[PDB]
Amino acid sequence: LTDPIADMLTRIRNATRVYKESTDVPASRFKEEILRILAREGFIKGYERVDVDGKPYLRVYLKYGPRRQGPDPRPEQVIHHIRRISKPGRRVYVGVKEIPRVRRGLGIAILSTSKGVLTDREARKLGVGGELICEVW
Amino acid sequence: VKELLEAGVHFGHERKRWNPKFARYIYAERNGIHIIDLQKTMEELERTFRFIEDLAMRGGTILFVGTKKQAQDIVRMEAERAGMPYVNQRWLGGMLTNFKTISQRVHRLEELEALFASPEIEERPKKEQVRLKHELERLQKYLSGFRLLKRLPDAIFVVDPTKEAIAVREARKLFIPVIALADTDSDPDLVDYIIPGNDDAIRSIQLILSRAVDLIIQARGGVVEPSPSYA
Amino acid sequence: GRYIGPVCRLCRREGVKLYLKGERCYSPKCAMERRPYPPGQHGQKRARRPSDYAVRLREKQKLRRIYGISERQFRNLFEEASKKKGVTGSVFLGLLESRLDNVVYRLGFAVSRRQARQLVRHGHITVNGRRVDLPSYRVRPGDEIAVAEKSRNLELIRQNLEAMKGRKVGPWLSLDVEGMKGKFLRLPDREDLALPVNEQLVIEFYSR
Amino acid sequence: DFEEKMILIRRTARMQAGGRRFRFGALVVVGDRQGRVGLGFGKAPEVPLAVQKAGYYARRNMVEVPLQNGTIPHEIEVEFGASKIVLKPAAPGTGVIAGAVPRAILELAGVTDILTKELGSRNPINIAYATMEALRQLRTKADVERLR
RNA sequence: CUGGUCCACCCGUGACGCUGAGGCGCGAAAGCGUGGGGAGCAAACCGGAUUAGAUACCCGGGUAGUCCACGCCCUAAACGAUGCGCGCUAGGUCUCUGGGUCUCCUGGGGGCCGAAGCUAACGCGUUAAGCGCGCCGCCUGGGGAGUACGGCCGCAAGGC
RNA sequence: AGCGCCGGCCAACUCCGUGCCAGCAGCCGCGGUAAUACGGAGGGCGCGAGCGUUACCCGGAUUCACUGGGCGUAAAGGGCGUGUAGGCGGCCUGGGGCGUCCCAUGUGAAAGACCACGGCUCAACCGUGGGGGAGCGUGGGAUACGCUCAGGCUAGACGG
Ligand code: SF4
Ligand SMILES: [Mg+2]
Ligand SMILES: [Mg+2]
Ligand SMILES: [Mg+2]
Ligand SMILES: [Mg+2]
Ligand SMILES: [Mg+2]
Ligand SMILES: [Mg+2]
Ligand SMILES: [Mg+2]
Ligand SMILES: [Mg+2]
Ligand SMILES: [Mg+2]
Ligand SMILES: [Mg+2]
Ligand SMILES: [Mg+2]
Ligand SMILES: [Mg+2]
Ligand SMILES: [Mg+2]
Ligand SMILES: [Mg+2]
Ligand SMILES: [Mg+2]
Ligand SMILES: [Mg+2]
Ligand SMILES: [Mg+2]
Ligand SMILES: [Mg+2]
Ligand SMILES: [Mg+2]
């Protein structure tokens, strides 16, 4: 497996699209810190470190909207959109002045900085940049 | 109003001819058959009836649909009692989605009801008598429970959602909420108010539809005692 | 230079009176009053649906034709507005307004801007004292726009000064008859003018 | 009542022995210039009936666009088939910078300030629906906190 | 004599991995060299028909070749017109081959039908053409043209 | 006061003459006896000491696509392996701080451009002040991620 991060986000995107309550992703002290942001900002209900066949995972509790009126009652997503920015194929790094404004404020950019994993908003606050991990809304 | 030995009547059916969205409403699979968790059937009969109740005491119509041979007769019974419309026979296309045009055919039904209520001529040529009557029976044959419906129902009750997916579709296009009894050959998310039970046993169709009607009359003005069930 | 020809055909093509003459503009001898249909052989033929492009051309031309201004000069202002802070549509009208010859006609010294030019051009107008014969002088707030001393005694300006005694002048301007001098107070809010122009459609013309 | 614009009215044809036989198609947008738009495409044996039918469907299909000082809340990109529409928030002076098709929709919707771009197939019909579904996915600061 | 592969046991190693410009090998048929072999078949070729004509199709003949050894050629509708590896996203049914507590379940493979989703449509859909990461190859209007020139390969044909 | 245009793109329509001729033409296309498309005319549209043509650059062209495309059937998967360089790479702990990020400081000439103001009656042109920047040097800091070194692991891989 070549990108653990991209893998996680996709495990999520894929599940959210058939409306699973949760999904398991292989555990990591870096992936968690990202989940810590996904939950805090209310994209997920949250996560808990579980175990499958002796091996550490992160069970991720997914969140959606109301049932709907019309022929397609499938609720709206909370995570409509999540995608790698930086990648192993091309590391993407921004300085503070060039951190993007996701979706006109309504979305976030998680980034990894030397002050930990932050959002665009938070990064601007401590005034640091870093590897732009991804974008969510 | 609910009863608990529906076990004595229905507890679902069907082998792996299922739909996997129905997973949540299922206990285990026995006789090479999907067996429905009754305790879930319960949680639901309640929530459904609460919807059913609120609709009678506001005096809102309910469209009853079931045409598989099993639920065929028992809808003519149970719906007539609440005097609410039904289709027992063939489900004509566009009954909701094209109401005003479909219905323009009930005025023809009525028009024959008059024209045969005598006279307005019987010096109409012999075959013309015979001709028009045949038409009359025909309209009657499909439309007999439909005419009661003079406006789009505020809700609809279906026996087999799969079998009557057209119906569910037309309602859904209109925002007309759908209540239905439905076994494992069916798609759950497609129903607003749901009765996860056998839909092919005349036993089951009987319990579920009757208590529905009974709950209808009871919060409508009156109460009644037993109504016809074929042994 | 500027348009300098039959000026009634302008109004007729525009489907609206533009007050390009002065006096005869208010009479029933006005062209729009007699033939409110486009100049030339086919004016009475039933108009067919103007295209979008068509529409925005006319609204632009109309605004332009009002000021007697050349298409370049018009452009250069607009572009100026597009670079300048605020709502371009407002600022554009504002800058169109700050033209000497327009200011002069707005303060009533002339019956037509077309006459308000020849006045400025023939040096009968001045600003803050000093003479100005430039129909394009960009007038700022605070400016005293007066008739020339040696021109105060002239038949035509007299006749025209006599006509303003109590007719009220826009909120952005003050006027002192007898003193033959007016004053430029501020740039017009759009409401302060009510020209038959959806100025938005002008922006839309220049973004193609 | 509603304000109404005809975007596209086209003639099509089908073959038969003895000749081609025509039919007309009417793309119409309909709006209140204050946040409510509808798109309808309607066909009939003749031009006006088609326009009428079109306008009819339009009303039978609407969307509530969440204006904000005459601009949309956020950037939106939508693909409908091979057509793509780009919608981007613009400040007061900007105007509507767009081609006719998404122009007609955004203006009659009461959008007064936006930057747009058509990418991919610029077939009017497909660009039309693509602009609709685009608007229809717009979310407000509220809409979002409420969701999350 | 010898390669690949799958299963079960969960015993050993401790990221030893993926892809891969070049390079190297293998590469249907036809074809080529040297030597065999040659029943049937059969380019070329002779002849009979058919037909307006019939350098064809159909009929009677017939040499290379088709076969073997060794060395060349290196193409193809060499196709799933679908590069490889990994992870993730409903199921129904038919089947080959394992291991089970052998009703049934669990692997690895081959088909069909389909959830979501994709898609210009046609169609694809845990054997993805879905959702994603890595690396490679390739495209950028039709013709001229896979031609010319050059270079490299080849006995030639011809190949790149 | 001139010049281009008035079939569609594209704003501007009628009469005569001509008759697949003479001719127009940027693309699509006009002309074969009722041409808004040729030539003249009236009229109209557009600009105006200018108007138009030719040439060339960027744009429209997300049509080389970093932003921002693609390859079953539209152009596009190498005939298939093996593998060199390269590109890329699982979980946990530390050391270093190369990438990366932040602060300071030097440099980043003048003019030009951008915002303010002001001088030539305006402007063009010109003057005074202001705002910065990427990028490189220096000093100090951070250590999530990528790197590197070091020590562990077993879910990848390989072996029994
Ligand atoms: S008269 Fe005055 S208004 Fe009427 S046409 Fe001539 S200029 Fe225009
Ligand atoms: Mg990027
Ligand atoms: Mg059933
Ligand atoms: Mg000039
Ligand atoms: Mg408009
Ligand atoms: Mg501006
Ligand atoms: Mg006016
Ligand atoms: Mg006025
Ligand atoms: Mg421009
Ligand atoms: Mg909304
Ligand atoms: Mg499209
Ligand atoms: Mg696409
Ligand atoms: Mg804003
Ligand atoms: Mg096109
Ligand atoms: Mg072991
Ligand atoms: Mg390999
Ligand atoms: Mg190679
Ligand atoms: Mg070969
Ligand atoms: Mg051979
Ligand atoms: Mg051979």
Ligand SMILES: [Mg+2]
């Ligand atoms: Mg040989």
Ligand SMILES: [Mg+2]
């Ligand atoms: Mg022969």
Ligand SMILES: [Mg+2]
């Ligand atoms: Mg012969």
Ligand SMILES: [Mg+2]
């Ligand atoms: Mg022969």
Ligand SMILES: [Mg+2]
């Ligand atoms: Mg032969």
Ligand SMILES: [Mg+2]
């Ligand atoms: Mg033979």
Ligand SMILES: [Mg+2]
């Ligand atoms: Mg022989």
Ligand SMILES: [Mg+2]
């Ligand atoms: Mg030979």
Ligand SMILES: [Mg+2]
């Ligand atoms: Mg030979």
Ligand SMILES: [Mg+2]
């Ligand atoms: Mg094949």
Ligand SMILES: [Mg+2]
């Ligand atoms: Mg294969």
Ligand SMILES: [Mg+2]
């Ligand atoms: Mg090929």
Ligand SMILES: [Mg+2]
């Ligand atoms: Mg490859």
Ligand SMILES: [Mg+2]
């Ligand atoms: Mg690929």
Ligand SMILES: [Mg+2]
């Ligand atoms: Mg098996």
Ligand SMILES: [Mg+2]
């Ligand atoms: Mg076995």
